[PDB]
Fold this protein.
Amino acid sequence: SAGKTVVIALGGNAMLQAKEKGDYDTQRKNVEIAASEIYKIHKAGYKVVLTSGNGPQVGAIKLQNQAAAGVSPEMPLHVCGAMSQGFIGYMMSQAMDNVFCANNEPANCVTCVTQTLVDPKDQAFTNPTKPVGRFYTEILREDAGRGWRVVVPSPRPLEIVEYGVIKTLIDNNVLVICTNGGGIPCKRENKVISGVDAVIDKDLATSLLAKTLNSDYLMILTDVLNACIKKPDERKLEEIKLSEILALEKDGHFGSMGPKVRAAIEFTQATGKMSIITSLSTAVDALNGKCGTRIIKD
Amino acid sequence: SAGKTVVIALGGNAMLKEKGDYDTQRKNVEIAASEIYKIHKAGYKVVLTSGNGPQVGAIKLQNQAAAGVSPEMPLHVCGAMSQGFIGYMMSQAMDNVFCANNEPANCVTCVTQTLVDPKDQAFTNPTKPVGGWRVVVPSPRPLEIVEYGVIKTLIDNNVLVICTNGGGIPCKRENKVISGVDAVIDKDLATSLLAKTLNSDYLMILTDVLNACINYKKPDERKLEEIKLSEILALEKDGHFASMGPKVRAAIEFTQATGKMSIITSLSTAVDALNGKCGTRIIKD
């Protein structure tokens, strides 16, 4: 119709916080919160593509697979990927509809299972850098600081396989959840896609997806708005130019806020378009130019 | 976009004595794919569904290792997981065959929720075997398809659509909140419901068995070819089917509610079934 299309990137912390159970209920509960915050964007008349993360979820599922002779064959990590999609996407769907219905907007919303393409010869296959699963001291389990997660390969996304449909599903004004966990990692090679055991960075695949669709906005929701430097002589970002943080990101100043910034930098670089990192709460607000790290065409 | 639209609900050997590791399934799907692709080059618009059982049963088994600092998940969520994995299987399958026929194009899987009646007798009588055999769960009757208006859309634009895998997350609605209920709906009944709602030109349920037969291994034997709606609700009302049972139930309700041909056919012969050179083709009058 007439709304500008926004691509939003919900955190995995936004369903299973570091210190929270991992129970279905527990998770669903937090997702009904988000649902309600995303709804405000739809209400305001924007198009929504909803994407999210996977940490908590893909990690849980593979732990289980690895308890692996309760008569039951162990599924590859890409498959677990397959599985988290069915999951989170089920949760996000059901909530995005509850909210709709709650509003007497009886309406329309799907979840597409996505594959993302990657280079098998990517370096992250011989270097598992990316946290997965849950927390606890003590293949390799790694620091992180807050508590010794598992790590998997994490190679670059290159092509959303399913973009054509998502695209279609937006042109027909459908609120689409897709690319959860940034897509089931696969590789083309010889006219046949097949799946590689990895987990792709939500913020890069959401970046890649944004440019692919040519969205009017890239919005990565967090729980922590902007980025700081806590010290006496601090400054955290609001509206800033693609001049200023191409530069400021290069001063090293960016653990968790890094690939975030990197992704927003990429989108905003290649489409002229504004990109936003905000706390989930203030989502709608940042679209009106009233807060958040909006990084701009410059 | 001139293609008539055909709603096909795949078997269990679409992914399968044999079990069950990932490579093993992938191939059996790869094989149904190539079959389903034939139909899409013939021109029909295709809506592809299937089953959970083995896949959802076994996802469910793994949650029963309920302690590996990882929390067990209700049936309906293993349900979602199934759709993730099965839909990811067919999804990739087709894409490859599309590429192979140099037809680079469009196919998705939508994760699908199905409304059921919280009061359905099957929530007390758990009679559909999942993972002599038989972890057997409740199997109630599918009322509405939640993602219907999107699917109907995704076909109006001729995208190949894969949904109602496992007949979709069983759910109940009440007080305008949808929510999951620990169960597993019959693939076939559900894919029928869907097609009739979508008002498809065709429902089709592919077994292994190329055609249904009354009284088995026994002529007096009659493998059924093309029959009238009169004749076989009548033949069903007299127990010639209680395994082929739901299959025959589903088709009957859809020719009934739409006045449209149904087919029951081995996957090997859908295309031919489409062109009236076998199957159980069950038509109105």
Observations:
- Residues 1-298 of chain A form a domain with the Carbamate kinase fold (CATH 3.40.1160.10).
